[PDB]
Symmetry: C2
Subunit: 268 residues, 2 copies
């Protein structure tokens, strides 16, 4: 028996999810067929490749498929999306509570004394809208709506670095930054150290995903974990349940704060 999985080849978070989906699938007696998405291999191609095999289900990690696309897919095989809502009643989803996640980051920073906090969003990437919304609501909750900045970013290191550059040029640069994800925060960190600014002595930085990048010994990035192990187990069980005939579900998992060494007392 086979479960189809579409993931992004150069994405750390998808790497964790995939490794965990393989283990969950095996525990359930299922094999996995991976179909990679890459700059030269569109998601439509990767998804279409799984259709060429005996996949009993299709699990799309952070898919950018529109409602029509997912509908067309759901018409051919049980489908479930990971790290984002499906938008369609018949397409299941296993995602992280992005709004609660970002809120943990902000709460953590305001508790350390930070008032001027910025966010480098993930643009139109899955989860970007929610974290952006969560960031703003979280700052408001602390009565810091006035000192909250949001700059467009992305999912890569460059967008992280450009975002941080932009922020440093602000009339009043932030003392803390919440990057869209870990790869993005890596870029933020790289720019800060090269610019003579110490983390956290001068600026605190928080990432998202708790990927291999965050646990690197000399980086020790504070970040939000989405619990890749349970998300993967839920995704697999979710797909196997839809295969059995059960109704598609929108499961939201709670994230947790992972404190390392990139955040600390606000300066001065």
């Amino acid at each position: 028996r086979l479960l189809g999985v579409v993931f992004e080849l150069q994405q750390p978070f998808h790497g964790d999810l995939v490794e965990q989906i393989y283990a969950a699938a095996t525990r359930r007696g299922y094999d996995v067929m991976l179909s990679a998405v890459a700059p030269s291999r569109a998601e439509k191609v990767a998804v279409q490749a799984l259709m060429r095999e005996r996949c009993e289900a299709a699990i799309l990690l952070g898919t950018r498929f529109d409602t029509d696309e997912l509908g067309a897919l759901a018409d051919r095989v049980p489908a479930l999306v990971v790290a984002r809502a499906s938008g369609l009643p018949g397409v299941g989803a296993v995602r992280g509570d992005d709004v609660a996640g970002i809120t943990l980051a902000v709460d953590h920073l305001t508790e350390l004394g930070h008032r001027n906090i910025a966010h480098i969003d993930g643009a139109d990437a899955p989860g970007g809208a929610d974290r952006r919304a969560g960031f703003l609501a979280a700052m408001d909750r602390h009565g810091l709506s006035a000192s909250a900045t949001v700059v467009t970013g992305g999912t890569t290191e460059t967008e992280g670095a450009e975002g941080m550059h932009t922020l440093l040029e602000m009339p009043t640069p932030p003392t803390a930054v919440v990057a869209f994800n870990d790869r993005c925060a890596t870029g933020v960190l790289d720019l800060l150290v090269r610019s003579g600014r110490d983390v956290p002595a001068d600026i605190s930085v928080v990432g998202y995903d708790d990927s291999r990048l965050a646990r690197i010994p000399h980086v020790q990035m504070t970040t939000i974990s989405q619990d890749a192990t349970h998300m993967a187990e839920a995704a697999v069980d979710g797909a196997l349940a839809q295969i059995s005939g059960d109704k598609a579900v929108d499961l939201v998992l709670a994230p947790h704060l992972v404190r390392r060494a990139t955040t600390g007392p606000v300066a001065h």
Copy 2:
């Protein structure tokens, strides 16, 4: 039903260079009318488990990227399906291989650095990872050719940013730290650069750094890492053709490809 031919590909999840090779293999495969079935290797999923997984499929060949299988494991695999390893020698007749000329590659790195005036040059090797021994021997040979055997340093490293950092730390503690460092691969170099910048040292002003693979890490706009390319696209096409050739019944070949230097901003004249 038999109108869709499969090529099996075993690779390391989250390994930059395997990601580049996989992307290109998919493309080369498609150009030849073949689909690709990936089977990933990860800490919780042994390469042995990944290969058996491919066996439960209709793969007409198995392409292993940087495999760690010994003669016996490879042999057993070759007895079930034509096989070809990438980025290393098979060490077995009947098992094809498509790899870069590691000795030649590191020699380019060394020639580039000595040409820029560097003499105290260090190499953080890849330990026992595929390519490790060759780049280490190639490094020492090249240093000797330039009359620098007495100012050549080799420290045991690895393939991750952590070994890069640790190896660089070790090198900085030395009586006579090196002015240039050739890392095993780009990910290792990433750690070297991370440590150097956090230590207040400028690259290349104070110290020059060279990576290997020319992976996405090296081209990142703010990293701009001088590195050695293995030409992933050509390596991927060659691996696919070698596999399709072995399926056609042709004898297994050990194809060695020439690498080239890709200069960016992490190397420069010696301080």
